[PDB]
């Protein structure tokens, strides 16, 4: 590799691991789009497995990435809508407050103060409509933005409704094999568990549990190389050669709405470029705040830090990508640490390379 990006990367990572006592973590980094990979420690404490580039972690709300994408082949599949209503794929939702809740709303968190877990207790078909029926918005819809997987999650169960596929099927078929992403997975397969990392939260290893809608929202595994090629065919869409899936990626880093710095895609989320670290990490406490609607969405901006965050209760990712520098990074880690970290990590690596 570069010297230069092994440096950074090397210099950067490494207080970072010892900080936050990270016991494994795997790292790439793309440069005029070519990746580097980088890994340390375990990816199984007791039975001492290293992390390698083969090392399977827990997504968490990185998965919404994808969930966006999907839904953007979609709708350049001519199967949905953004600004169709919400009852158009599910007539059962018959509830008055779910009059003027497009798809849009659900794909960008606005409609209206869905709340942030779907409660442990849906499980069914049924619980799940009972649920959406029997929630009350505090905001009317495109109003106020709040983080939800309740509202993502539901437009990825409803985005592919009228493909007949499940979510998982119309993730493998449309998004993951196209992309090569063959070690990318909503459910970790047996042949796999072998590379499938322990998650340590207070020093027990622990992976996600089942819930409603977690496929959809935060289910989906992978791979430093898998994901380094994700954040590739995010950076240069026009190289892919399915025509709904380039331009699925497209509309996922179109800007809908906008708060303070930050402008809402489907599930990818930017700001512009050249963007202080501060800014990026002015969006711990979860935060109920007005959006201002973008009329019409901008077409992805090339000078844009597009990136997403996520964690479960045992692990912690970033991504982060720019778009006209031909940079990106990602950060996989099998304990979940403070956001604030991984982006001053991130940042503090692109900045010395672009
Ligand atoms: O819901 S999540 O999508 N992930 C998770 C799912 C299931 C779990 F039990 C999790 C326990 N701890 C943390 C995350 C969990 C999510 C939520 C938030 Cl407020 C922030 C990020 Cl970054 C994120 O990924």
Redesign the pocket.
């Known amino acids: 590799a570069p010297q230069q990006i092994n440096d950074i990367v090397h210099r950067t990572i490494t207080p970072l691991i010892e900080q936050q006592k990270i016991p494994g973590m795997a790292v790439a980094v793309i440069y005029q789009g070519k990746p580097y990979y980088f890994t340390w420690g375990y990816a199984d404490i007791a039975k001492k497995q290293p992390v390698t580039q083969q090392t399977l972690f827990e997504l968490?709300?990185?998965?919404?990435t994808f969930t966006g994408v999907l839904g953007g082949d979609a709708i350049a599949r001519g199967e949905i809508k953004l600004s169709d209503p919400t009852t158009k794929y599910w007539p059962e939702l018959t509830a008055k407050q779910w009059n003027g809740i497009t798809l849009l709303h659900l794909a960008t968190y606005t409609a209206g103060g869905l709340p942030?877990?779907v409660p442990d207790e849906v499980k069914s078909s049924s619980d799940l409509l009972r649920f959406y029926q029997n929630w009350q918005p505090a905001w009317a819809p495109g109003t106020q933005r709040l983080?939800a997987?309740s509202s993502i999650g539901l437009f990825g169960a409803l985005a592919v409704k009228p493909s007949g596929l499940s979510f998982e099927q119309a993730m493998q078929t449309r998004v993951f094999q196209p992309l090569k992403l063959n070690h990318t997975w909503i459910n970790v397969p047996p042949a796999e568990e072998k590379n499938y990392a322990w998650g340590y939260r207070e020093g027990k290893a622990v992976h996600?549990?089942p819930?409603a809608l977690?496929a959809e929202?935060?289910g989906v595994k992978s791979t430093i190389e898998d994901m380094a090629r994700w954040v590739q065919s995010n950076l240069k869409p026009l190289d892919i050669n399915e025509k709904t899936l380039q331009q699925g990626i497209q509309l996922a880093q179109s800007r809908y709405w906008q708060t303070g710095d930050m402008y809402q895609g489907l599930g990818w989320e930017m700001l512009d470029w050249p963007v202080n670290p501060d800014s990026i990490i002015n969006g711990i406490a979860?935060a109920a705040r007005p959006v201002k609607a973008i009329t019409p969405p901008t077409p992805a901006v090339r000078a844009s830090w597009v990136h997403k965050?996520?964690?479960?209760?045992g692990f912690?990712?970033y991504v982060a990508f720019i778009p006209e520098k031909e940079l990106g990074i990602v950060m996989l880690a099998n304990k979940?640490y403070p956001?604030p970290a991984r982006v001053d990590a991130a940042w503090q690596i692109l900045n010395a390379l672009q």
């Open positions: 968490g709300s990185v998965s919404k942030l877990q983080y997987n996600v549990s819930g977690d929202a935060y979860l965050t996520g964690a479960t209760g912690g990712s979940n956001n």
